[PDB]
Coordinates of C-alpha atoms and ligand atoms in Angstrom, one line a residue:
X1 CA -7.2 -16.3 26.8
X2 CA -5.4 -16.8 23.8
X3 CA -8.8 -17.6 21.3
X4 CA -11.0 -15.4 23.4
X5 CA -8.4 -13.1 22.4
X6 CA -8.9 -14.3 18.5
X7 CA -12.6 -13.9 18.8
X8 CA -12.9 -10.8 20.2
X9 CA -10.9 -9.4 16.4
X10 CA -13.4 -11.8 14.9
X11 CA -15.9 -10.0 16.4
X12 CA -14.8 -6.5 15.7
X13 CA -15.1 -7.1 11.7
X14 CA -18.2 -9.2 12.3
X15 CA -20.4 -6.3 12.9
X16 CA -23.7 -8.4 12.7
X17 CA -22.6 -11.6 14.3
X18 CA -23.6 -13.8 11.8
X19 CA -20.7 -16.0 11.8
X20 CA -18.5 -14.7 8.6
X21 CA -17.1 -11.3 7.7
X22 CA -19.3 -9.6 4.6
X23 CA -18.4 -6.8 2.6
X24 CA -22.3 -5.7 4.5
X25 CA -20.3 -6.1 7.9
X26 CA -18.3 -3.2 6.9
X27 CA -20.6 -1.2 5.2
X28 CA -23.6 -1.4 8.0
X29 CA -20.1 0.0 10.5
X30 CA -19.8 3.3 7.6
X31 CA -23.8 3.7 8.2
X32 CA -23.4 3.1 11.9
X33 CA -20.6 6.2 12.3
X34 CA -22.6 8.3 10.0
X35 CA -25.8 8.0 11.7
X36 CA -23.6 8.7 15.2
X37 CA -22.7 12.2 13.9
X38 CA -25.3 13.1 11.7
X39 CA -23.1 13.1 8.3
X40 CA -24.9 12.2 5.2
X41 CA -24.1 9.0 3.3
X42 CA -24.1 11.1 0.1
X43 CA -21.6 13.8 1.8
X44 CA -18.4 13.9 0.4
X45 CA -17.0 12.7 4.4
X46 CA -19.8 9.9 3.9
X47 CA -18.3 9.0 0.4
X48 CA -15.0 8.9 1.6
X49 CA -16.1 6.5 4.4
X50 CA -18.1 4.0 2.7
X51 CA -14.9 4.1 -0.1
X52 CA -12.2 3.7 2.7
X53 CA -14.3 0.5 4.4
X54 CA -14.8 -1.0 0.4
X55 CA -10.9 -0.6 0.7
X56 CA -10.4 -2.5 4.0
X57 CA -12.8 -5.1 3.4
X58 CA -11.3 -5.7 0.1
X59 CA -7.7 -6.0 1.8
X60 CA -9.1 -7.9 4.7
X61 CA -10.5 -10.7 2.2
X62 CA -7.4 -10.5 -0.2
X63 CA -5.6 -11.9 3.0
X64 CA -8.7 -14.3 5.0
X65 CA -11.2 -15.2 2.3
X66 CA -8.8 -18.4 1.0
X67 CA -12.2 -20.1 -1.0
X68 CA -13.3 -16.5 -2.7
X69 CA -16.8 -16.9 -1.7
X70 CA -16.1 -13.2 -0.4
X71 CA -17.3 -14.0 3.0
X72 CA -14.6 -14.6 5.5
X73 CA -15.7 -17.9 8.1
X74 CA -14.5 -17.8 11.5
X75 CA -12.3 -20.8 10.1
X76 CA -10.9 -18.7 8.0
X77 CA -10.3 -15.9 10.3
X78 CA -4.3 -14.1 12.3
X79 CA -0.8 -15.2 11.5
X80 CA -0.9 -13.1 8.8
X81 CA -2.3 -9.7 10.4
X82 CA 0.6 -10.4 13.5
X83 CA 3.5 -11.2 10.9
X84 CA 2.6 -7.8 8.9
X85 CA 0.4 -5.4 11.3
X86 CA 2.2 -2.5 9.6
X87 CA 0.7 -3.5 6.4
X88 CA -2.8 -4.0 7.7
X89 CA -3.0 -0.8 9.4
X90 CA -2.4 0.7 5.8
X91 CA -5.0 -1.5 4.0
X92 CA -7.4 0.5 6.5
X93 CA -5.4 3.8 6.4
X94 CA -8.0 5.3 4.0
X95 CA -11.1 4.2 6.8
X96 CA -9.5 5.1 9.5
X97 CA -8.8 8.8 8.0
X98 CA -12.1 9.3 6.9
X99 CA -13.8 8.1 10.5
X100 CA -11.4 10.4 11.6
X101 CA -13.3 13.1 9.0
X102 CA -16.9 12.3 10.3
X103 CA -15.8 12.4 13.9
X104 CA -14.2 15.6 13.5
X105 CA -17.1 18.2 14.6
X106 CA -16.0 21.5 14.4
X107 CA -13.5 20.9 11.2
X108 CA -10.5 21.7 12.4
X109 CA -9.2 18.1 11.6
X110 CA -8.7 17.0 14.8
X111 CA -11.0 14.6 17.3
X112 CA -11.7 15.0 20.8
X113 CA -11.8 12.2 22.8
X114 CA -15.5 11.4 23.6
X115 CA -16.5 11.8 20.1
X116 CA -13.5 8.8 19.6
X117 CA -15.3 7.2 22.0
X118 CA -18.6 7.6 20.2
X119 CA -17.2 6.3 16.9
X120 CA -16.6 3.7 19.0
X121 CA -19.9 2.7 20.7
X122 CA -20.7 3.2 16.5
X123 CA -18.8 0.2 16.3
X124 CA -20.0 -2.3 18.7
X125 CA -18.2 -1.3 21.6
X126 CA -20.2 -1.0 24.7
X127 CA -20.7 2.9 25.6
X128 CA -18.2 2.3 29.3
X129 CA -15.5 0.6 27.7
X130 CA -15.3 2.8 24.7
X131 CA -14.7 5.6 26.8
X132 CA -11.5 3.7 28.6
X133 CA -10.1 2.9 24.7
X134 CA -10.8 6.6 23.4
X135 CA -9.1 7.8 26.5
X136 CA -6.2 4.9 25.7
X137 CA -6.1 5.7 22.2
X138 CA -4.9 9.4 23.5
X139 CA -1.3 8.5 24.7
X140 CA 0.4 12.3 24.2
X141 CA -2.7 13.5 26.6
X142 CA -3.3 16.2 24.7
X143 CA -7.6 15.5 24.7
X144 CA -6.8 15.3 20.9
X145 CA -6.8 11.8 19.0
X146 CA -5.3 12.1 15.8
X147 CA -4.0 9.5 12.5
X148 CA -1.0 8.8 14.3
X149 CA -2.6 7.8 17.3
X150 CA -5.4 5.3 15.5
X151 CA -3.5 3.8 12.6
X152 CA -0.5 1.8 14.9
X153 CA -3.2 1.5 17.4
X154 CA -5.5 -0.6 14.9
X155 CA -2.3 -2.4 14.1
X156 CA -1.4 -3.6 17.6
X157 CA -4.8 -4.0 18.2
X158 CA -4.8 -6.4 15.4
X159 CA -1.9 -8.5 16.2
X160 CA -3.1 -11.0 18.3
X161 CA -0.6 -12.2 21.1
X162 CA 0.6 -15.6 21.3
Ligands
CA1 CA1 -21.2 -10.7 9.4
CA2 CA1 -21.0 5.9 -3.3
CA3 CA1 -14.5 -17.7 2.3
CA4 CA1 -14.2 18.1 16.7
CA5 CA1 -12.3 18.8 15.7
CA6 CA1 -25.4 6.1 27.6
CA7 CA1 -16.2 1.4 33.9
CA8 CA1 -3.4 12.9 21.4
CA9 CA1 -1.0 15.2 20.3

């Protein structure tokens, strides 16, 4: 349970299952979510996003890549992100609010739930279980999911249990 548990975070940042995270791994995710809604890569929400996963990646690799080769091994790849999940979660602050930008259809800076579960599927997650975690992600009910929903989410979700 416990290292299916480890791979299945591995797996998250791996976006093209290649065996080691890339900075490409987080950029191909930015294209992914832009291509989902239709939001330009040279749009100032698309600028934002590629920016915000530059950011992540760079944190992500301060913390895993330990030989600087800038790709992150499996091997490499957890006490760290459970010890500190607040600090993650603000590595990726700047991603997460700008995916929260492109998912955000009508402007009004909010973003319903089946378009969280759309940035989903954007990231790997298969179309009937994205739906269960956008709903999950949504814990006042309100049909809304918003920065304060998604940033301790991505924290706990990060912090692998023992
Ligand atoms: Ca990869
Ligand atoms: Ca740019
Ligand atoms: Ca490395
Ligand atoms: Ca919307
Ligand atoms: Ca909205
Ligand atoms: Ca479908
Ligand atoms: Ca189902
Ligand atoms: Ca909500
Ligand atoms: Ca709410």
């Amino acid at each position: 349970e416990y290292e299916r548990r480890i791979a299945a975070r591995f797996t998250t940042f791996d976006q093209d299952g290649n065996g080691h995270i890339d900075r490409s791994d987080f950029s191909g995710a930015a294209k992914a979510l832009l291509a989902e809604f239709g939001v330009a890569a040279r749009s100032d929400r698309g600028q934002a996003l590629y920016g915000g996963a530059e950011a992540l990646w760079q944190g992500l690799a301060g913390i895993a890549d330990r030989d600087g080769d800038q790709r992150i091994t499996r091997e490499e790849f957890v006490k760290r992100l459970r010890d500190k999940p607040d600090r993650f979660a603000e590595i990726a602050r700047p991603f997460l609010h700008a995916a929260l930008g492109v998912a955000d259809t009508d402007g009004d800076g909010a973003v319903t739930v089946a378009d969280t579960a759309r940035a989903l599927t954007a990231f790997g997650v298969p179309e009937d279980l994205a739906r269960q975690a956008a709903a999950a992600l949504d814990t006042d009910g309100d049909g809304k999911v918003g920065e304060t929903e998604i940033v301790p989410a991505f924290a706990r979700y990060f912090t692998v249990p023992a």
